[PDB]
Amino acid sequence: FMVSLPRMVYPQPKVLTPCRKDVLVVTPWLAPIVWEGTFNIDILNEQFRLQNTTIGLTVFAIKKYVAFLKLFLETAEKHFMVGHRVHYYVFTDQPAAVPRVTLGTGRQLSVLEVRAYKRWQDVSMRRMEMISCERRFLSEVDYLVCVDVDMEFRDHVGVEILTPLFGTLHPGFYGSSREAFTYERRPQSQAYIPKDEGDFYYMGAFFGGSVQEVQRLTRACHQAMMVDQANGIEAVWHDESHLNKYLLRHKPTKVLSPEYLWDQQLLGWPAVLRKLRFTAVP
């Protein structure tokens, strides 16, 4: 049950004037594509605070990648879901190397010890098995957000992203034709997508949704990866390839623009990006 919003004063949305004319702001299945200028954060914050929303953030820091946690967490404290309840879940092979980062009120961090795989490919992929922790998330958070650690927040990432299931447009492919998408192209793989299929190329570094939908996605991807392994094939881009197959066949209910996953070193700062929110660390 949802209580009424309070009286709020804000500019009237004008039907005969788009918020953005330069970009697609809704998919053909009527999912919003989240860009700066498309949302009033005050309205959204009200809607989500009235539900006492808790957001879980999962992040893997294995072997040398523990070095990225301090900046990741400090910047998340400045920019990620500020004002809302947040539970970070840090999955690591080195619990003692997790930095002691000072957290704001209503925010907590759990360190979860996992095994370290030799191959970075396996480390990256095996994130699906670990996320699929099932009993824990259901009791503790409403939404799960799954991100890479070699990153920093530079601007607001908030409740505008929350929805049953979301993916993020990969910054290298948002302007590309589908034939250029680096989907898995071998029919022998469960991740296979033909040249005439595909909506978007989503990045493995930022996806999420409700706990139920995220655990459906991660279970499905893990099972598909196990089939591939049994068949002696490894998808070209690992769990990202599987994530893309899943989101082709199960359309996300929001899509995040590349504001939400950017690499300024490789791609600069195009005019179409009004904000750079969450960016790669060299």
Indicate whether 239 belongs to the interface with Mn ion (CB under 5 A). Answer: no
- Contact residues for 271 (Cβ-Cβ < 8 A; gap 6+): none
Q: Tell me: does residue 98 bind ligand UDP (CB under 6 A).
A: no
- Which member of 148, 160, 184, 240 binds Mn ion (CB under 5 A)? 148
Q: For ligand UDP, which is the closer residue by CB, 24 or 116?
A: 116
* DSSP-derived 3-state class of residue 140: helix
Active site annotation includes 140: no
User: By the 8 A CB rule, do 48 and 84 touch?
Assistant: yes
Q: Does position 199 bind Mn ion by CB under 5 A?
A: no
Using rule CB under 6 A, residue 205 touches ligand UDP: yes
Distance (Å, whole) CA 202 – CA 183: 10
Residues in contact with 118: Cβ distance below 8 Å, sequence separation at least 6, in sequence order: none
Spatial contact of 280 and 222, defined as CB atoms under 8 Å apart: no
155 contacts ligand UDP (rule: CB under 6 A): no
**What token pair was written down for 185?**
């192209």
- Asked whether the CA dihedral 158, 161, 164, 170 is positive or negative, the reply is negative
Of 36, 150, 152, 155, the residue at the interface with Mn ion (CB under 5 A) is: 150
Structure tokens at 187: 């029919």
Binding part of the chain for ligand UDP, among 48-56, 148-156, 189-197, 241-249 by CB under 6 A, reads 148-156
Task: Report how far residue 66's alpha carbon sits from residue 32's, in angstroms, rounded to the nearest whole number.
Answer: 34
**Contact set with ligand UDP (CB under 6 A):** 60-63, 65, 120, 123-124, 148-150, 205
Mark the binding-site residues for UDP-N-acetyl-alpha-D-galactosamine, compressed into ranges: 60-62, 65, 148-150
Mark the binding-site residues, compressed into ranges: 60-62, 65, 148-150, 170, 182, 240, 263
**Contact set with Mn ion (CB under 5 A):** 148, 150
